[PDB]
């Protein structure tokens, strides 16, 4: 049953409530964006209304297969009214289509639901800078000081490099490049871009892809391999055999892969600056692991939250031990009291 940080007191609302049955109560489900996580349990057969942005109401139609009665699309950055009461959705700055949700309660409680987000100073001049918040419902994936990577910038530049160099060196060299989930499709385009290529894929990713409306993306994605230098494979399938495998499979037209696994953090950027990164090598194949996140770090986090100045926080991540809740509290606590609100 339907855990109390995904209800919004007040209301008939729950926010990436699926996978509970039926919720007593709830007159409207709300879906910030289209990971698995949190769209567990829709389907088809779902018959209560979906709030979502259109992009994720283009995915819950054709991977999914809801019912477009059920689909309710809002745009972004407009009030709109939902039964009976006034809401916003916003950018998260996280896959496509994510979306922060805005309620502005009858009794005049003021609530902000960031889904999942990368918090940005950007976001200081969203329809958030008008008027007070009192409840936030916080995206706290990396929250704590140890949390530290690069912008996405950097990370792009050290991958649109490291793939330009590698092929101008040797031009029958294959670029890869991991997925699992929507979202990081700045990597994949970038590289394919610089190389003069479109991106190779599968029929199911292409057609995710085609879900998102963007013509950009559009123009640089194709299910022809043959004809492209950059491919698309399951993250599980980025490993020493998995990439051999698919070599054989190009018929000796390359004779050499360099791939990536974005990731998010991992112990290495304790130690090791992007611009020092190095590969995994195994005679013809190097696999690259690069900090593409998107959550905000620790500092990002921090700094969003101290311009905001709630007066409650609701984490919706590592929520389930008393260690991390104990610790989350602690950090509140210190940007309450350094901050003065
Ligand atoms: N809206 C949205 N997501 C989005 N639009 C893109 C355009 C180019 C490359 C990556 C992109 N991701
Ligand atoms: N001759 C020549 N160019 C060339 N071929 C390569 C294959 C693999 C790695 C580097 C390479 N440079
Ligand atoms: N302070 C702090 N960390 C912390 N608090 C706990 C409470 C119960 C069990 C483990 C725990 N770890
Ligand atoms: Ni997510």
Redesign the pocket.
Known sequence: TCPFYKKIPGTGFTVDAFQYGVVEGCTAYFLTHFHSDHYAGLSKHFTFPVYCSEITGNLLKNKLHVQEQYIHPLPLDTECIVNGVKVVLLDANHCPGAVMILFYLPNGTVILHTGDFRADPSMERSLLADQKVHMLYLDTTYCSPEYTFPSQQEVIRFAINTAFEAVTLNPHALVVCGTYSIGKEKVFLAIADVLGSKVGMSQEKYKTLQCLNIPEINSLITTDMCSSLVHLLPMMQINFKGLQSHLKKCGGKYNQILAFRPTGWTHSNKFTRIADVIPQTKGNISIYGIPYSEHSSYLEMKRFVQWLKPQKIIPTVNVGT??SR??MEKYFREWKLEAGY
Do not use: F, I
Request: aromatic fraction near 24%; charged fraction near 25%.
């Open positions: 008393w260690k104990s610790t």
